[PDB]
Amino acid sequence: MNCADNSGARNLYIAASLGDMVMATVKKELRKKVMPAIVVRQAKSWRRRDGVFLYFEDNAGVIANPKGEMKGSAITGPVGKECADLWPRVASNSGVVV
Amino acid sequence: MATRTQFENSNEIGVFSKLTNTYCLVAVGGSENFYSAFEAELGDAIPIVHTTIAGTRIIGRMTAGNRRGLLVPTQTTDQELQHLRNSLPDSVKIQRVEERLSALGNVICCNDYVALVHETEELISDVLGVEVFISGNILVGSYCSLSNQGGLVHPQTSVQDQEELSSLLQVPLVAGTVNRGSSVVGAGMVVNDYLAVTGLDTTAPELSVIESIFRLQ
Amino acid sequence: RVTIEFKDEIVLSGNSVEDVSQNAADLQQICRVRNKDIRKFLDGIYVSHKGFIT
Amino acid sequence: PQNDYIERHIKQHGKRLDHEERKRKREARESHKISERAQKLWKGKQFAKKRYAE
Amino acid sequence: PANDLLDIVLNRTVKYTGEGFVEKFEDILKGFPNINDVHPFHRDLMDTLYEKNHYKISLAAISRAKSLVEQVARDYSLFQCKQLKRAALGRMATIVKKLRDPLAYLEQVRQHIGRLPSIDPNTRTVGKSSFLRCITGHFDYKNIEMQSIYAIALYFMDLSEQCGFTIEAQVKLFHSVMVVINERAQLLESVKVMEVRNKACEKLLASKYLLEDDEWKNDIMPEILDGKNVYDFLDPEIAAKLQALEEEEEKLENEGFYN
Amino acid sequence: GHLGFLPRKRAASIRARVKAFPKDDRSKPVALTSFLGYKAGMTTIVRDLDRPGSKFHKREVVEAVTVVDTPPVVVVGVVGYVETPRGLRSLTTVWAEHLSDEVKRRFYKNWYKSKKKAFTKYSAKYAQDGAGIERELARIKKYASVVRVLVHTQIRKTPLAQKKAHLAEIQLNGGSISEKVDWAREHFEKTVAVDSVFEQNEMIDAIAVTKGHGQRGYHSRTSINHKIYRVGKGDDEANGATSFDRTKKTITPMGGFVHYGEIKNDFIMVKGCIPGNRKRIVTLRKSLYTNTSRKALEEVSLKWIDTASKFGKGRFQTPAEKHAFMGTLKKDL
RNA sequence: GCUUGGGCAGUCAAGCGCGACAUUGCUAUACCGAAGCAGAAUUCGGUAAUGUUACCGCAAUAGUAAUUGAACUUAGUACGAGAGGAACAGUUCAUUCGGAUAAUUGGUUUUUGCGGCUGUCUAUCAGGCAUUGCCGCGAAGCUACAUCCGCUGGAUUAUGGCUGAACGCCUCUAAGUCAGAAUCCAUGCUAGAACGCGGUGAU
RNA sequence: UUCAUCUAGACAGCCGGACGGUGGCCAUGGAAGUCGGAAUCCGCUAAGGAGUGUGUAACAACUCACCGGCCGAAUGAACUA
């Protein structure tokens, strides 16, 4: 999946869904470095409790420490509504939602 | 005066709050502590509105307005806009931004007289009745705060930018941290001309700086 | 089950010894300081005095 | 966590109201509990060996 | 103690016993802080209190016992193969039983070290307990003889002679340091409540919804009429539209040239 | 799976039989306890959750519901039960003088070829002054410390070709069983509305045989804590004109239900999916007790109801919108 | 009537020169009791055909279930020099498993459906043949990346107590007695004895 | 079964006495019988271990073993079946 921050990471590498935090690595000094990541987009629509079938363009996520401290100072691209509300830190750096 | 409060054991008051001289916006929830945060100093002096933007608790991050008006992003639903209109008097102007964007509180920081943003400028000026003009910050709103008495910015703000804004704002500006060194000044506290709310992590030096900049004493 | 009357002290009187004694025991045994240090914590209600009504 | 805090608190306030009576009752009941363990309870053999050693 | 630990370990059952003993010994050793390597100030302070020689002897004895148990475990009809297990278990028990003295010594210090008034070295500094209680202990702003003597690594004086202590003794005991005062009065010159702390701070640093009217507050505004969200188009008294978009069905439908 | 639902053998009776009834109340007045209906269709429901401190507090929430056809139930008799060491026993039963055609048919397997010799002598026995029937009523009054009422549903009203009514027993939680039998005596051959038993937001349990999968399925199952979203009534205005919509329209999906007829008579909307497919016979019971929880106490705020066509696919709500979406049509002009 | 956890050398000595307890040199969840348990955390111990016919009914008996974690609130309060930080109860969510359903979505496949079309023909009018025509779209069925729900009363192990002899003290125990376990029985749920039963319509 | 007490008062339950050199010597930041080391005396009185325990940094206070008073017959310790 692509990285959802301005850190410049080419891609992210490790079921986990949007808003779930799992260990992740920056596939492409950061090689083979494990750090928790939060998924902000998955490019798939699920049965939302609000009844609206959300959609995204591509899978994306953010890499942060266990407490969720965003590595970058901003988030590139839209962020899932559930993920943004779940994590206040993500919302602070989030620019657009969906 | 400045007050130390919390929300769901979280010190990010600004994320779930937006204070104004005539009203206050807070996220929906049964946590009496959050309501007490604003009710302790002034009781029921000004109304407190429990609502949300796009059905989220980040209303504080998604809302950017002053005592004279309020603004909400496109993601805001019609029902939420109607609830906000019913919860505020006709004096406060409420309008929806139709531009492609969602984070208004993280991009726009303004007070009752001046507004700073990253056409929509005319709409912002009309709704808030303020002049529309920070140190290269990607998200000025998330790392800035303002009030008629004064304003607070992130510690990394350049001295030149602070001086220019203070000269334009006609009031002094001070850069400091919140919530025990946290650099998100706009997410850890919300202040008005006579009441400042800060999280528990806010240390004594930060509280003193907040009190001094707004010159309550 | 016995009467209640009154310092910060309760007074229980009843014709039947068993009834009043069991009531006092139940009152003392409901204030269980679970998962706490017995010596450090003294809060509760305990039997103090016994005697005849007369 | 000072040099002596539980002892200081006990001296300032004292032990529990029924600490003495409860301890005496436990000591008295230990006599019957020893017999019950001897007539009850590998564990029984170990208890018997410990009693014989005592 | 040694007896209780042996029973606890042996009640769960051959290498498992040795592994458990090694784990317990490692936890005891690692959990306890090395007296000679904590910190110079704290090292000396612990030296004045506990028997450092006995502490080191106990640590060495525990390490040697663990090594011996590991060595024994590594070295180690039905009766012929059965007696070996009993012999190994007895060997381990006998080796463990020799720890009563070091374990007894460590029992006293294990509890004591858990509630010491230890503070970080970077922390800024006649009945002095009364003043200590009054001042605050943490006051963040902005063997006994040797332990007391180690304060060299502030002093208090009394103008009167309270507690029965001679003024001459107080003057002699004195021999930067700040002196606090609550032929006899002249000898006091030989030395040469928050105010004292304020003065010392120098060196310390240098160290609800409404409407237009409440007449119709009970209205619900269904927000849907025949499947269209008319609320978005609920403009007040649209008189021009009410005619413009309603007269068409008669003015233009008369022609009706859709076919 | 679940050992409690074994052995997995085919159900002997198509109609599920209630195993237990709510505990009787000696102080409350005589009232019904269970109702009969037929499952019919499924649709989506949206509302706003007033549950305090919830993730969707004072905000919209969506889920799925099911509709059960519940035509008015008409009583046919009263059954008394006595307490015996071997279990509850029925000592005497009294039937009404007149019975519906469906009730008579239910007692037949060759109704067309049979002589239709239904209650004739018992019906003729009612021509007496009343001593014989009153004697049995007095006997039931003396004995039968617990009483039940036998009723049946109006199959003819439902859009089905079965034309055969289903007979079932209804328990009464009233008190003074003498008062119970007196009340029953005054309601023979009388129809009782659905609202008399259940109401909106009430919690009930539905029992029915699950779908047969060609051994898989065809077993009686029970689902408890089934909130009644709505209690439809054919006598009232269009059931689609909710308080939050107040617009006249039928709840039935446009074009009719899938493999089922239109619903216009009294019906009930049940949260979740009741076991079994459409055209079943489902017995409604009031949970056998009082469930204390926010789930039972919370009310329903139906802002919108999905009533569009569902035969494969559908987008319009009423037939008038089909041409409006596609514009004027040739068949229109 | 299998079975389950130190040798050598010396002092022992209830008893019968042998012989008892010590002793000297090597080689998961949950609930209770104790700890210097200040809070949290932690450690040690314990529990685990039958009269035919049709309907409405009872239940002898067999099986049984829910489950794991998270958030507000109690709270940044009792506690504590600060670091750190409770629990009960009132609320809100999610994960595993289970009884079911297809309302939206979606893998789906004889709509072997719809507009056009390929090699080609009596050429658009009509698709014949292409073991199953193709393109794009798409029914019914399998069926989940889809959805609803998943119960309350006693008796009890350990445990803490009341009254009170043995033993004129005493004792939770010997006669009695209260609270109490993921334990037992009950409520509920599934089946209903081809050979358990009751009432009713019909000759 | 073997011993001890026993109408010169059996076991048990309460009340009283339970001292003087003395706070023995050493150990002392203060430890006086009871945080420790080594002997254990005289005067006595029906009865005091330079002390069997609880407890205080030390005294303080209670105490069992030792006797007396109120009490009234068998009781206690160890062994065998």
Helix ranges, D1-54 (H): 6-13, 19-39, 43-53
3-state secondary structure of E30: helix
The first and second tokens of residue A78, run together, are 């839209």
C7 contact partners, CB below 8 Å, separation of at least 6: none
Structural fold of domain A1-98: Ribosomal Protein L14 (2.40.150)
Beta bridge partners of A60: A2, A41
Around E93, how many Cα atoms within 13 Å sit in the side-chain half-sphere?
A: 14
End-to-end alpha-carbon separation of chain D, Å?
39
Write the single-letter amino acid at B132: V
End-to-end alpha-carbon separation of chain F, Å?
60
Q: State the Cα–Cα distance between residues F276 and F212, nearest whole angstrom.
A: 9
Q: State the Cα–Cα distance between residues E102 and E110, nearest whole angstrom.
A: 12
Q: Answer whether B193's CB lies under 8 Å from B151's CB.
A: no
Q: State the Cα–Cα distance between residues F221 and E208, nearest whole angstrom.
A: 47
Domains of chain F listed by start with CATH number: 6-71+193-210+217-331 (2.40.30.10), 72-192 (3.30.1430.10)
Torsion of CA F43, F48, F53, F54, to 10 degrees: 30
Q: Answer whether F239's CB lies under 8 Å from F245's CB.
A: no
DSSP strand pairing (F191-192 vs B108-110): unpaired
User: Residue F88: in which H helix or E strand, if any?
Assistant: none
Q: Answer whether B148's CB lies under 8 Å from B169's CB.
A: no
F59 in reach of chain B (CB within 8 A): yes
Nearest residue in chain D measured CA to CA from E111: D3
D contact chains, 3+ CB pairs < 8 A? C, E
Kindly list the domain boundaries of chain B, sorted by start residue: 1-217
240-259 in E: which are within 8 Å (CB) of F?
256, 258-259
F–C touching, 3+ CB–CB pairs within 8 Å: no
Nucleic strand H within 7 A of Cβ E239: no
Structural fold of domain B1-217: L-arginine/glycine Amidinotransferase; Chain A (3.75.10)
Q: Locate breaks in chain D with C to N over 2.5 A; list the residue preceding each.
A: 41
Residue of B10, B75, B184 lying closest to A97 (CB–CB):
B75
E172 is in an annotated binding site: no
Here the contacts of B150-154 (C-beta below 8 Å, separation 24 or greater) are B150/B174, B150/B213, B150/B214, B150/B215, B151/B111, B151/B213, B152/B176, B152/B178, B152/B185, B152/B189, B152/B191, B152/B209, B152/B210, B152/B213, B153/B185, B154/B183, B154/B184, B154/B185
E74 contact partners, CB below 8 Å, separation of at least 6: none
Q: How far is CA E248 from the centre of its chain?
A: 81
**In Å, what is the CA distance from C20 to each residue of B196, C9, C11, C26?**
58, 15, 10, 10
Q: How far is CA F319 from the centre of its chain?
A: 30
24-53 in C: which are within 8 Å (CB) of D?
28, 37-40, 42, 46-48
Hits for CB < 7 Å against strand H across E residues 133-172: 144-145, 148
How is the beta sheet containing B196-198 ordered, strand by strand?
B2-4, B196-198, B189-191
The first and second tokens of residue C10, run together, are 């309760």
Q: Answer whether B159's CB lies under 8 Å from B167's CB.
A: no
Picking from F127, F145, F49, F137, the residue whose alpha carbon sits closest to that of residue F88 is F145
Here the contacts of B213-217 (C-beta below 8 Å, separation 24 or greater) are B213/B149, B213/B150, B213/B151, B213/B152, B213/B172, B213/B173, B213/B174, B214/B147, B214/B149, B214/B150, B215/B149, B215/B150, B216/B1, B216/B2, B216/B149
Around F257, how many Cα atoms within 13 Å sit in the side-chain half-sphere?
A: 24
Q: State the Cα–Cα distance between residues A70 and A66, nearest whole angstrom.
A: 10
The first and second tokens of residue E2, run together, are 């040694």
F333 contacts E258? CB cut-off 8 A: yes
B202 contact partners, CB below 8 Å, separation of at least 6: B4, B11, B178, B179, B180, B188, B189, B210
E235 contact partners, CB below 8 Å, separation of at least 6: none
For residue F212, which nucleotide's C1' is closest to its Cα? G100
F317 contacts E223? CB cut-off 8 A: no
Give exposure, B25-42, as e/b (b: 16+ Cβ within 10 Å): bbbbbebeebbebbeebe
Q: State the Cα–Cα distance between residues A96 and E38, nearest whole angstrom.
A: 52
Q: State the Cα–Cα distance between residues F284 and F208, nearest whole angstrom.
A: 10
User: Residue F228: in which H helix or E strand, if any?
Assistant: strand F220-231
3-state secondary structure of E172: helix
Three-state SS for chain B is CEEECCECCECCCHHHEEECCCCEEEECCCCHHHHHHHHHHHCCCCCEEEECECCECCHHHHCCCECCEEEECCCCCHHHHHHHHHHCCCCCEEEECCCCCCCCCCCEEECCCEEEECCHHHHHHHHHCCEECCCCCCCCHHHEEECCCCEEECCCCCHHHHHHHHHHHCCCEEECCECCCECCHHHHEEECCCCEEECCCCCHHHHHHHHHHHCCC
E114 is in an annotated binding site: no
Q: State the Cα–Cα distance between residues E175 and B158, nearest whole angstrom.
A: 54
Chain D residues with beta carbon closer than 8 angstroms to that of E117: 1-3
What are the DSSP calls for F302-323, one per residue? EEEE--S--SS----SSTHHHH
Instruction: Specify the DSSP class assigned to residue A71.
Output: S
Q: Answer whether F123's CB lies under 8 Å from F98's CB.
A: yes
3-state secondary structure of F77: strand
Around F309, how many Cα atoms within 13 Å sit in the side-chain half-sphere?
A: 13
3-state secondary structure of F268: strand
- Residue that is written with structure tokens 């509760």 in the block: C44
Q: How many CB pairs under 8 A join C and D?
A: 17
Q: State the Cα–Cα distance between residues E209 and E217, nearest whole angstrom.
A: 9
Chain B residues with beta carbon closer than 8 angstroms to that of A91: 15, 58, 61
The first and second tokens of residue A8, run together, are 């410049």
DSSP strand pairing (F203-209 vs F220-231): antiparallel
Residue of D10, D17, D18 lying closest to C39 (CB–CB):
D10
- Determine how many CB atoms are found less than 10 A away from the CB of residue F10: 10
Structural domain boundaries, residue E257: 208-259
E15 is in an annotated binding site: no
Strand G, nucleotides < 7 Å from a protein CB: these are 4-7, 21-22, 26-27, 32-41, 44-46, 53-60, 63-65, 71-76, 79-83, 86-87, 90-94, 98-105, 111, 138-140, 142-143, 145-152, 159-164, 166, 170-174, 176-179, 187-192, 196-203
Picking from E169, E173, E167, the residue whose alpha carbon sits closest to that of residue E186 is E167
- Determine how many CB atoms are found less than 10 A away from the CB of residue F330: 7
Picking from B68, B105, B67, B62, the residue whose alpha carbon sits closest to that of residue B81 is B62
E20 is in an annotated binding site: no
Q: How far is CA E202 from the centre of its chain?
A: 30
For residue E163, which nucleotide's C1' is closest to its Cα? H29
Q: Cα-flanking dihedrals φ and ψ of residue F192, to 5°?
A: -115, 130
Residue of E208, E229, E232 lying closest to B47 (CB–CB):
E208
Q: State the Cα–Cα distance between residues D12 and E108, nearest whole angstrom.
A: 25
Picking from D3, D9, D27, the residue whose alpha carbon sits closest to that of residue C42 is D9
Q: Answer whether F58's CB lies under 8 Å from F102's CB.
A: no
Give resolution in angstroms.
3.5
**Does a cis peptide bond (omega within 30 degrees of 0) precede residue F22?**
no
3-state secondary structure of F132: helix
Q: State the Cα–Cα distance between residues B19 and B2, nearest whole angstrom.
A: 13
Nucleic strand G within 7 A of Cβ F273: yes
DSSP strand pairing (E155-157 vs F282-285): unpaired
Chain B residues with beta carbon closer than 8 angstroms to that of E229: 78
Mutate to test the interface with A, among F44, F51, F62 (most CBs of A within 10 A): F62
DSSP strand pairing (B93-96 vs B69-72): parallel
B–E touching, 3+ CB–CB pairs within 8 Å: yes
Q: State the Cα–Cα distance between residues C46 and C26, nearest whole angstrom.
A: 10
For residue F293, which nucleotide's C1' is closest to its Cα? G91
User: How was it solved?
Assistant: cryo-EM
Picking from F155, F159, F164, F162, the residue whose alpha carbon sits closest to that of residue F261 is F159
What are the DSSP calls for F155-191, one per residue? TTTSS-S-----EEEEE---S-HHHHHHHHHTTTT-E
E227 in reach of chain F (CB within 8 A): yes
E113: closest CA of chain B, how far (Å)? 31
CA–C1' distance F135–G78 (Å)? 73
Nucleic strand H within 7 A of Cβ D7: yes
3-state secondary structure of A61: strand
What are the DSSP calls for E97-160, one per residue? HTTHHHHHHHHHHHHHGGG-----TTS----HHHHHHHH--------HHHHHHGGG--EEE-SS
CA–C1' distance A1–G143 (Å)? 30
- Residue that is written with structure tokens 């959300």 in the block: A54
Helix ranges, A1-98 (H): 81-86, 88-93
C42 contacts D13? CB cut-off 8 A: yes
Q: Cα-flanking dihedrals φ and ψ of residue A90, to 5°?
A: -65, -40
